[PDB]
């Protein structure tokens, strides 16, 4: 027998008319599920790219989900194929997530499609907090690191519509619509707050200031977008204690830029917490 | 060999206390002043390091500055040295521009003060269109390529703030003050497009899409900048019409990303229209 038992697995997705690749190592009926940043590459999830996740996590008593694919994706469902650059099927990544996804694991590889984890970073970050606010009992912890929190507010659908051109030449018309439509509402983790209130969803959100340590990271990219994104999520800080939020851990430290080496600190620093929320 | 050899000249700032390296190739009485970019570094100006530039006005009747140095400066008179960074000196970049440089040029090269034109990209686009806007008798003549060109107006302050800090850690209020302070909107070129009416300046006005050709600069931070100056640049366009401009190039083809080849490619482009203004 091997070691750490990484696999390379291929999911059918019904939604999507194809078998969507999920990097998945078994260790426990809960799973963490590693959602990747806006350029989610076809062959490999960046989490097992540039950290030790896998490693990290083996033996912690919780399985390790890593989907593969999805670039500019936002892990939702979209309206339509992506007008521009010729996609040819729709993204139905919440459907495939939150349906077809835990369904094939529960019958293939003995993982809970209740009681798990949903860990997001850049643009994944806003997804898992929206997969916990409309799916809380498959999702009771979400972590948010360096997300995006208020999409939906002031230039915020201007800068993403832009990043999404940049990154495969997606449209984020044919996602949410023009930005006046309610999907954009409906994404929003600062406008769903009250959802994650009402659920009590174990929240773990996190952003640097722009300033790089010892880790790494420092470029200019990585240091202008956590400087930018991280007003919007201390307002989330504070919205969610106004509306009554009293389940979630806020990391705001003096340092760390928009780069992997700060995330896997953070997904390390979580262990002991997502152990206890979901094993108890 | 009209103005060759390219020279180096070393000309002192009496105001920052200094000496200014100017790189310069003669060949006329009138003068193009290249600006360079936020990252501006201390040995060459970025459109000799990026481009042909010396290579494509030798000949052209019309002299070259290139003045070098001034990280984050914005080519203006700031309030005070940049605090954060230990800057241990006031950047007075527009006085050295407008009143030292052009009177060392006239005495030891025969450069006229006045007749010329001001040419700059990214940070100094919107410089190129004050420095006109405030000395008109200097600068007939403006260009601004993939310039930000409303920069006391909504997020711009902030985000200006940001990039300053991550390139080199300069202090945007260091510069022009609380965003409250008249300088903003005195140094804000669509606010000051009255001027640039009043004064019948010619105005050449650039702005990329995002999408790169096989000119280059694919990358994400160069297709994203570029996508995001290139509303402002469409609003001060619209507005300059509203104004009663008549007297400007608008060039927003459906290419283009924030790098020097593009901006090289405007430099050439340019030039028949420079020569005309300035010498016929």
Redesign the interface.
């Known amino acids: 027998r091997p070691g750490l038992p990484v696999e390379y697995l291929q999911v059918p997705s019904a939604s999507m008319g194809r078998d969507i690749k999920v990097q998945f190592q078994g260790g426990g009926p809960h799973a963490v599920y590693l959602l990747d940043g806006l350029?989610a590459q076809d062959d490999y999830n960046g989490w097992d790219i540039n950290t030790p996740a896998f490693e990290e996590y083996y033996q912690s008593g919780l399985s390790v989900i890593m989907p593969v694919g999805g670039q500019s994706s936002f892990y939702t469902d979209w309206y339509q194929p992506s007008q521009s650059n010729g996609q040819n099927y729709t993204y139905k990544w919440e459907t495939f997530l939150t349906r077809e996804m835990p369904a094939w694991l529960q019958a293939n590889k003995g993982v809970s499609p209740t009681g798990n984890a949903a860990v997001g970073l850049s643009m994944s970050g806003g997804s898992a907090l929206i997969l916990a606010a409309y799916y809380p009992q498959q999702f009771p912890y979400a972590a948010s690191l360096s997300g995006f929190l208020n999409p939906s507010e002031?230039?915020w659908p201007?800068?993403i519509g832009?990043?999404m051109?940049?990154?495969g030449g997606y449209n984020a018309n044919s996602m949410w619509g023009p930005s006046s439509d309610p999907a954009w509402k409906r994404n929003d983790p600062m406008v769903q707050i009250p959802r994650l209130v009402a659920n009590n969803t174990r929240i773990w959100v996190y952003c640097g200031n722009?300033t790089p340590s010892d880790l790494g990271g420092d470029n200019?990219?990585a240091?202008?977008l956590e400087?930018?994104t991280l007003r919007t999520n201390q307002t989330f800080r504070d919205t969610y204690a106004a509306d009554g939020g009293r389940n979630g851990v806020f990391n705001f430290p003096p340092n760390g830029t928009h780069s992997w080496p700060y995330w896997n600190e953070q997904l390390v620093a979580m262990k002991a917490d997502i152990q206890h929320v979901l094993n108890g």
């Open positions: 350029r002031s230039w201007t800068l832009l990043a051109n940049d990154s722009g200019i990219p240091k202008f400087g930018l």
